[PDB]
Amino acid sequence: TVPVALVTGAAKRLGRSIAEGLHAEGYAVCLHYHRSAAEANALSATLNARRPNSAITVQADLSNVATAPAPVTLFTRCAELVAACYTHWGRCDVLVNNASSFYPTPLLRREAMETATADLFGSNAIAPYFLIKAFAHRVAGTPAKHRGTNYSIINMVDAMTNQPLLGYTIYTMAKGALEGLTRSAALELAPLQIRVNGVGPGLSVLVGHRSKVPLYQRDSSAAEVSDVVIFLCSSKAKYITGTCVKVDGGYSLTRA
Amino acid sequence: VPVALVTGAAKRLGRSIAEGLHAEGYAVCLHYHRSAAEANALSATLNARRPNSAITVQADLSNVATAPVTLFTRCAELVAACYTHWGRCDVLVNNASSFYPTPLLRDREAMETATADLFGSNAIAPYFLIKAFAHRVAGTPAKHRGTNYSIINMVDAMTNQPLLGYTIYTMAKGALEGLTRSAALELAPLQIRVNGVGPGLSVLVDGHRSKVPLYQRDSSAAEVSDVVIFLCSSKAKYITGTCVKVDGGYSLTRA
Amino acid sequence: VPVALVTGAAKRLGRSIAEGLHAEGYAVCLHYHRSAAEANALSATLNARRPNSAITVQADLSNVATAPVAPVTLFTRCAELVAACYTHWGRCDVLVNNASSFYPTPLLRGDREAMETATADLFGSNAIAPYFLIKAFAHRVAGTPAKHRGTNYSIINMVDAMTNQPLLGYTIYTMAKGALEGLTRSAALELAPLQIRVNGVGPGLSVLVDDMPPAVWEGHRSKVPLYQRDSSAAEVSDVVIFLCSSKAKYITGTCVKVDGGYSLTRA
Amino acid sequence: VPVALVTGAAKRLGRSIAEGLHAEGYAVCLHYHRSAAEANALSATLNARRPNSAITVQADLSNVATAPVAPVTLFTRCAELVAACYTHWGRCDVLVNNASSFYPTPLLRNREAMETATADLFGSNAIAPYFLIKAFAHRVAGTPAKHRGTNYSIINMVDAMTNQPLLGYTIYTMAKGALEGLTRSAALELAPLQIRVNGVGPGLSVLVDDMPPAVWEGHRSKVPLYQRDSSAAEVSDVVIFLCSSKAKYITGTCVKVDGGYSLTRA
Ligand SMILES: NC(=O)C1=CN([C@@H]2O[C@H](COP(=O)(O)OP(=O)(O)OC[C@H]3O[C@@H](n4cnc5c(N)ncnc54)[C@H](OP(=O)(O)O)[C@@H]3O)[C@@H](O)[C@H]2O)C=CC1
Ligand SMILES: NC(=O)C1=CN([C@@H]2O[C@H](COP(=O)(O)OP(=O)(O)OC[C@H]3O[C@@H](n4cnc5c(N)ncnc54)[C@H](OP(=O)(O)O)[C@@H]3O)[C@@H](O)[C@H]2O)C=CC1
Ligand SMILES: NC(=O)C1=CN([C@@H]2O[C@H](COP(=O)(O)OP(=O)(O)OC[C@H]3O[C@@H](n4cnc5c(N)ncnc54)[C@H](OP(=O)(O)O)[C@@H]3O)[C@@H](O)[C@H]2O)C=CC1
Ligand SMILES: NC(=O)C1=CN([C@@H]2O[C@H](COP(=O)(O)OP(=O)(O)OC[C@H]3O[C@@H](n4cnc5c(N)ncnc54)[C@H](OP(=O)(O)O)[C@@H]3O)[C@@H](O)[C@H]2O)C=CC1
């Protein structure tokens, strides 16, 4: 049986490493993207070249805003992403909420305030919520006899948000929401044997903070994070749910 | 005479907090959404005890426009109301909170308003309120600033042990915890303290209470508001970015 | 008149705690290990303000047997501290596990002794003594007929707001503090039926010792987000006192950081 | 061919962990206290599968001095376990602090009992692990850089449920809290030697069934995922993963393996 994985923000960096890892384990992969169409399609071509019909791409803005066709709501856009997996491959075994907007929202010195709120909160928390709902309904709507045997949802959190980055309040809040989503979803979806966990990087693939990481005194590679993600998706991890794993080289253990 | 703004001050915990702060000498701006009668009754009681020690302000803190007026604007206006009437705002208490199911498992705009209401009241409104509050302090010349600025976020001691079916509420509380820490850090330079108070079971609607280790009952409003009040006192000036459980040990239990 | 036992009461945070409780009307049993002169000076001050409101008891809380007053065990020494409260005043309403040894136990580089004594000292003072003290305290309340019990039993464990961001080289100390946090939760749960509340207070930097260059000391305190300084003893003891008040009677099993946001920082 | 020392390896989780590591090619030093028969049986199986891939060492990890052949301290007995790995195979790449005593130490409802309970519960769950880590760390530091292994990993078996204390188990819960502290402090201090230190916290695994079937069923039925306790393998696979080179950026973290049990409330 060939399992399917949906990965948001799959075009590059961690998202792309995650998709590659899942693909190397035999997953067919639905690569979501927002703006990185060229990289997304280039990745699909690589994956489909290795193994025919093992990759597709879907575009979507996951910000908590209406888009033009009545207006399309973020929920609808999310349901469509999950539906694209069932339409093409007839299944969706794994969901990885990786897409994430990250920029300052200082408390100390309108259009910007409102789009920032919906963008940061949508991508990091609200989209993943609706995505999980859509994913869950599909599974519930599948007759028990026909369900997969290893449903796994991974939320990309942040190992460092408890030690807030000065000026990033909304981003930090959204990640805090995502942690709550992880726990609440693990509990409510446990009956459908759908596991929900979180993976929190510290510093990965930076574009003198490296030297602060206790382990290796450097940021991590994408693989050093994606391997963790892949492991949590494996049947060997089927008893793990509702937990967040830090992948930070001990950075969260430090103090100023 | 210090001023305190308390959202959702009309009844229950919000009312207890206002009364507590008032008993310590605070002038209190009582925010309310729908409980206009209860809000005005309380103001009358407080103003009767001490002239000009209470006002009331109506506002929907759901992340939606009204009349268009954005949530941020409505929030700025709440804080402005304090400076307009009394010329100051020393304490902010983000207490207002919507609480109802958002099941993941068995409706179009039903989830739309739920999203904006649950997230607005519990997280986004508090964010804008804190911004507005922080902005007024920063805009106040150092010599004229108060000496005990305190923001309290009402969190939930039990959200790490999620209530089945309440994902969006739980998510909003998680955001509020993040707001508490991020704000404490960024506002430390203005000497504005930001903390959280997390009830377990308090003043139940109407069992579940027999589950509480301590006293085997839910708490009274005072048992929570006193903690809020203490965190606002100058005896607590070194505390910031922390959340205090007031749950009688409920979070220490397991199924 | 309610009684409070405070371990390591002779100076610094322990003294401030005793003074605070004393200012609220508590009679205070001041425990000390080596600071006899400081302890007696404090008792004198408290007894001078209010006759018979203070006493002092000496005890090594390290997890080692002591010279017969058959060797005396740590548990026995702990029971005796609690007993000294009931013997003199007929009661013990509040316990504050404040005493604490603090020094390096590096993982990397007349010798065994230092290893075996460090283990028992750091662990005893910070965790094991508090355990037996709580047991003793718990036993005395349980042995009191309901009709004679106090109405506000409170136990406070002094923890560390920064142990989750370990100080390099202090593994055993950090370990003992983690054990203390465990004790706090387990005790709150088990003693809830006797209405004995058990909480923790975790300082960050308080009355930071200045055995180092002025600038190096400016550095450390400047890392605290709020006020860019370590705290005074009062800024911590007032929190302790509050947790002991009847206005905190619904709080139990919780640890309160008093760190001015220090734990929110990163390297 | 890497070496792994596993304490309390004789049965249950310890055994599953040794088997897991053995299946990955590790040579395994199986520590035991009282389960000599089960320990030797396991060694035989492993050695039969791959010659000279298993040994055993007996040791009481309680924080008490043992009788020789001058009393032996816990630290010495700990160094000797680590030494046994370097003596036999010339290396120790992985350490798994699995050994653990677990029994009640009530505060109420009421000897050499309390002196031994304290030392046994605290020794096995915390103090031994401390000294073992020290010993393990010294051996690595005393190895010239050019000869060091490339994947040093220490895993501490913690408890996903200690923050929701089991009534009457104060000392155990305290020792587990100390073990968590040990995990973080050690990760930090040993980072420079590239020695990773993490924790794995089971919830309910291979739940002891010494009670009415209904009572046993009620207990496991509380676990949200599968409504059952876990198998040993469902825990050991996590341990094994954390030891793999794919996990070489993870350190100072504790991973719950509890099927969501810690998410529940009374
Ligand atoms: N890298 C690090 O040091 C850390 C990473 N993390 C988390 O790990 C995950 C991946 O990290 P990283 O690779 O750095 O991520 P990136 O910052 O590179 O962003 C990943 C993708 O998110 C997509 N995205 C952003 N906003 C939206 C939106 N509004 N709608 C739809 N898609 C959007 C972008 O896709 P596109 O280009 O197609 O528009 C982008 O490629 C993230 O969730 C991040 O929060 C956490 C802590 C540290
Ligand atoms: N009580 C408990 O057991 C627990 C309480 N808490 C938290 O403590 C705080 C107070 O608790 P409690 O007294 O029970 O709170 P309530 O549930 O009684 O709600 C408080 C007030 O919030 C206001 N409110 C709700 N939605 C909105 C909105 N969209 N815009 C503006 N105001 C709104 C309401 O004001 P109005 O009536 O005027 O419309 C209401 O009176 C809350 O933050 C809650 O989350 C956390 C855990 C447990
Ligand atoms: N001050 C700070 O920055 C921080 C403090 N804390 C905690 O707060 C509490 C008080 O802090 P602080 O005032 O600095 O504490 P101190 O370091 O000054 O120690 C307090 C007392 O503990 C006693 N003590 C130490 N070892 C033993 C022992 N083996 N047996 C009996 N008594 C012993 C000493 O009593 P004597 O002198 O009589 O021998 C000492 O006066 C402690 O628990 C500490 O761990 C936590 C984080 C930070
Ligand atoms: N199983 C579960 O549901 C849970 C397990 N855990 C943790 O997982 C780990 C393994 O679990 P599990 O397999 O159940 O463990 P066990 O309860 O079976 O104990 C493991 C081994 O520890 C050894 N041991 C106990 N005390 C000592 C001592 N004083 N000195 C030396 N060795 C000692 C015993 O070895 P011997 O037989 O040779 O004497 C025993 O076989 C433990 O650390 C445990 O705390 C945590 C939560 C739940």
mmCIF file with all atom_site columns, N, CA and C in Angstrom, chain B residues 130-156:
data_model
loop_
_atom_site.group_PDB
_atom_site.id
_atom_site.type_symbol
_atom_site.label_atom_id
_atom_site.label_alt_id
_atom_site.label_comp_id
_atom_site.label_asym_id
_atom_site.label_entity_id
_atom_site.label_seq_id
_atom_site.pdbx_PDB_ins_code
_atom_site.Cartn_x
_atom_site.Cartn_y
_atom_site.Cartn_z
_atom_site.occupancy
_atom_site.B_iso_or_equiv
_atom_site.pdbx_formal_charge
_atom_site.auth_seq_id
_atom_site.auth_comp_id
_atom_site.auth_asym_id
_atom_site.auth_atom_id
_atom_site.pdbx_PDB_model_num
ATOM 1  N N  . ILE B 1 130 ? -3.139 45.399 25.301 1.00 0.00 ? 130 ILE B N  1
ATOM 2  C CA . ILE B 1 130 ? -1.811 45.542 25.889 1.00 0.00 ? 130 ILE B CA 1
ATOM 3  C C  . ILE B 1 130 ? -0.999 46.556 25.091 1.00 0.00 ? 130 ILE B C  1
ATOM 4  N N  . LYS B 1 131 ? -1.118 46.485 23.763 1.00 0.00 ? 131 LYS B N  1
ATOM 5  C CA . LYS B 1 131 ? -0.436 47.426 22.887 1.00 0.00 ? 131 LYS B CA 1
ATOM 6  C C  . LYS B 1 131 ? -0.857 48.861 23.219 1.00 0.00 ? 131 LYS B C  1
ATOM 7  N N  . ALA B 1 132 ? -2.175 49.088 23.254 1.00 0.00 ? 132 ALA B N  1
ATOM 8  C CA . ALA B 1 132 ? -2.726 50.399 23.550 1.00 0.00 ? 132 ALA B CA 1
ATOM 9  C C  . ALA B 1 132 ? -2.256 50.879 24.932 1.00 0.00 ? 132 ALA B C  1
ATOM 10 N N  . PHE B 1 133 ? -2.397 50.013 25.937 1.00 0.00 ? 133 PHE B N  1
ATOM 11 C CA . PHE B 1 133 ? -1.903 50.296 27.279 1.00 0.00 ? 133 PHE B CA 1
ATOM 12 C C  . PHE B 1 133 ? -0.403 50.675 27.265 1.00 0.00 ? 133 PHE B C  1
ATOM 13 N N  . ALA B 1 134 ? 0.411  49.858 26.587 1.00 0.00 ? 134 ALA B N  1
ATOM 14 C CA . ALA B 1 134 ? 1.862  50.085 26.511 1.00 0.00 ? 134 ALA B CA 1
ATOM 15 C C  . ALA B 1 134 ? 2.187  51.415 25.834 1.00 0.00 ? 134 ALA B C  1
ATOM 16 N N  . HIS B 1 135 ? 1.423  51.727 24.788 1.00 0.00 ? 135 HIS B N  1
ATOM 17 C CA . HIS B 1 135 ? 1.585  52.944 24.009 1.00 0.00 ? 135 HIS B CA 1
ATOM 18 C C  . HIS B 1 135 ? 1.325  54.207 24.871 1.00 0.00 ? 135 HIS B C  1
ATOM 19 N N  . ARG B 1 136 ? 0.263  54.194 25.676 1.00 0.00 ? 136 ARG B N  1
ATOM 20 C CA . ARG B 1 136 ? -0.040 55.333 26.540 1.00 0.00 ? 136 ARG B CA 1
ATOM 21 C C  . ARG B 1 136 ? 1.020  55.571 27.613 1.00 0.00 ? 136 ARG B C  1
ATOM 22 N N  . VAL B 1 137 ? 1.575  54.502 28.179 1.00 0.00 ? 137 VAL B N  1
ATOM 23 C CA . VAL B 1 137 ? 2.658  54.615 29.172 1.00 0.00 ? 137 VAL B CA 1
ATOM 24 C C  . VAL B 1 137 ? 3.908  55.210 28.515 1.00 0.00 ? 137 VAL B C  1
ATOM 25 N N  . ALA B 1 138 ? 4.299  54.635 27.383 1.00 0.00 ? 138 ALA B N  1
ATOM 26 C CA . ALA B 1 138 ? 5.450  55.116 26.625 1.00 0.00 ? 138 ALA B CA 1
ATOM 27 C C  . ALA B 1 138 ? 5.287  56.591 26.226 1.00 0.00 ? 138 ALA B C  1
ATOM 28 N N  . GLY B 1 139 ? 4.062  56.983 25.890 1.00 0.00 ? 139 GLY B N  1
ATOM 29 C CA . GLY B 1 139 ? 3.783  58.350 25.533 1.00 0.00 ? 139 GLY B CA 1
ATOM 30 C C  . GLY B 1 139 ? 3.692  59.274 26.734 1.00 0.00 ? 139 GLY B C  1
ATOM 31 N N  . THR B 1 140 ? 3.734  58.712 27.950 1.00 0.00 ? 140 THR B N  1
ATOM 32 C CA . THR B 1 140 ? 3.741  59.519 29.176 1.00 0.00 ? 140 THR B CA 1
ATOM 33 C C  . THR B 1 140 ? 5.191  59.847 29.559 1.00 0.00 ? 140 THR B C  1
ATOM 34 N N  . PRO B 1 141 ? 5.508  61.126 29.807 1.00 0.00 ? 141 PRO B N  1
ATOM 35 C CA . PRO B 1 141 ? 6.864  61.492 30.241 1.00 0.00 ? 141 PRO B CA 1
ATOM 36 C C  . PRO B 1 141 ? 7.250  60.774 31.532 1.00 0.00 ? 141 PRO B C  1
ATOM 37 N N  . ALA B 1 142 ? 8.472  60.255 31.563 1.00 0.00 ? 142 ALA B N  1
ATOM 38 C CA . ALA B 1 142 ? 8.945  59.451 32.684 1.00 0.00 ? 142 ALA B CA 1
ATOM 39 C C  . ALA B 1 142 ? 8.544  60.000 34.063 1.00 0.00 ? 142 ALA B C  1
ATOM 40 N N  . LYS B 1 143 ? 8.727  61.300 34.274 1.00 0.00 ? 143 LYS B N  1
ATOM 41 C CA . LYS B 1 143 ? 8.430  61.882 35.587 1.00 0.00 ? 143 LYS B CA 1
ATOM 42 C C  . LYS B 1 143 ? 6.959  61.731 36.001 1.00 0.00 ? 143 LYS B C  1
ATOM 43 N N  . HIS B 1 144 ? 6.042  61.608 35.035 1.00 0.00 ? 144 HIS B N  1
ATOM 44 C CA . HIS B 1 144 ? 4.609  61.544 35.340 1.00 0.00 ? 144 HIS B CA 1
ATOM 45 C C  . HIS B 1 144 ? 4.031  60.115 35.295 1.00 0.00 ? 144 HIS B C  1
ATOM 46 N N  . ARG B 1 145 ? 4.884  59.113 35.078 1.00 0.00 ? 145 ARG B N  1
ATOM 47 C CA . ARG B 1 145 ? 4.431  57.718 34.968 1.00 0.00 ? 145 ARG B CA 1
ATOM 48 C C  . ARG B 1 145 ? 4.080  57.186 36.327 1.00 0.00 ? 145 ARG B C  1
ATOM 49 N N  . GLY B 1 146 ? 3.167  56.217 36.376 1.00 0.00 ? 146 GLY B N  1
ATOM 50 C CA . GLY B 1 146 ? 2.855  55.568 37.639 1.00 0.00 ? 146 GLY B CA 1
ATOM 51 C C  . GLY B 1 146 ? 4.040  54.737 38.119 1.00 0.00 ? 146 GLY B C  1
ATOM 52 N N  . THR B 1 147 ? 3.918  54.163 39.308 1.00 0.00 ? 147 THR B N  1
ATOM 53 C CA . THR B 1 147 ? 5.042  53.423 39.849 1.00 0.00 ? 147 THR B CA 1
ATOM 54 C C  . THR B 1 147 ? 4.717  51.940 40.009 1.00 0.00 ? 147 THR B C  1
ATOM 55 N N  . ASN B 1 148 ? 3.561  51.529 39.515 1.00 0.00 ? 148 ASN B N  1
ATOM 56 C CA . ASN B 1 148 ? 3.148  50.150 39.653 1.00 0.00 ? 148 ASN B CA 1
ATOM 57 C C  . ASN B 1 148 ? 2.176  49.720 38.537 1.00 0.00 ? 148 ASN B C  1
ATOM 58 N N  . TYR B 1 149 ? 2.709  49.637 37.318 1.00 0.00 ? 149 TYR B N  1
ATOM 59 C CA . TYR B 1 149 ? 1.946  49.195 36.148 1.00 0.00 ? 149 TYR B CA 1
ATOM 60 C C  . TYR B 1 149 ? 1.877  47.688 36.121 1.00 0.00 ? 149 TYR B C  1
ATOM 61 N N  . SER B 1 150 ? 0.658  47.176 36.002 1.00 0.00 ? 150 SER B N  1
ATOM 62 C CA . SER B 1 150 ? 0.435  45.740 36.085 1.00 0.00 ? 150 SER B CA 1
ATOM 63 C C  . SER B 1 150 ? -0.665 45.244 35.144 1.00 0.00 ? 150 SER B C  1
ATOM 64 N N  . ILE B 1 151 ? -0.302 44.272 34.309 1.00 0.00 ? 151 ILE B N  1
ATOM 65 C CA . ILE B 1 151 ? -1.252 43.614 33.424 1.00 0.00 ? 151 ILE B CA 1
ATOM 66 C C  . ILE B 1 151 ? -1.434 42.144 33.816 1.00 0.00 ? 151 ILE B C  1
ATOM 67 N N  . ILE B 1 152 ? -2.685 41.725 33.960 1.00 0.00 ? 152 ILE B N  1
ATOM 68 C CA . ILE B 1 152 ? -3.005 40.363 34.347 1.00 0.00 ? 152 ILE B CA 1
ATOM 69 C C  . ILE B 1 152 ? -3.858 39.732 33.268 1.00 0.00 ? 152 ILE B C  1
ATOM 70 N N  . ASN B 1 153 ? -3.405 38.586 32.769 1.00 0.00 ? 153 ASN B N  1
ATOM 71 C CA . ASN B 1 153 ? -4.150 37.811 31.813 1.00 0.00 ? 153 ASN B CA 1
ATOM 72 C C  . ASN B 1 153 ? -4.794 36.628 32.488 1.00 0.00 ? 153 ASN B C  1
ATOM 73 N N  . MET B 1 154 ? -6.098 36.467 32.298 1.00 0.00 ? 154 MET B N  1
ATOM 74 C CA . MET B 1 154 ? -6.791 35.318 32.891 1.00 0.00 ? 154 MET B CA 1
ATOM 75 C C  . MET B 1 154 ? -6.609 34.134 31.964 1.00 0.00 ? 154 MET B C  1
ATOM 76 N N  . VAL B 1 155 ? -5.755 33.205 32.391 1.00 0.00 ? 155 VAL B N  1
ATOM 77 C CA . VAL B 1 155 ? -5.508 31.992 31.623 1.00 0.00 ? 155 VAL B CA 1
ATOM 78 C C  . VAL B 1 155 ? -6.315 30.829 32.212 1.00 0.00 ? 155 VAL B C  1
ATOM 79 N N  . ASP B 1 156 ? -5.894 29.599 31.922 1.00 0.00 ? 156 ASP B N  1
ATOM 80 C CA . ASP B 1 156 ? -6.619 28.424 32.362 1.00 0.00 ? 156 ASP B CA 1
ATOM 81 C C  . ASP B 1 156 ? -5.623 27.417 32.883 1.00 0.00 ? 156 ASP B C  1
#
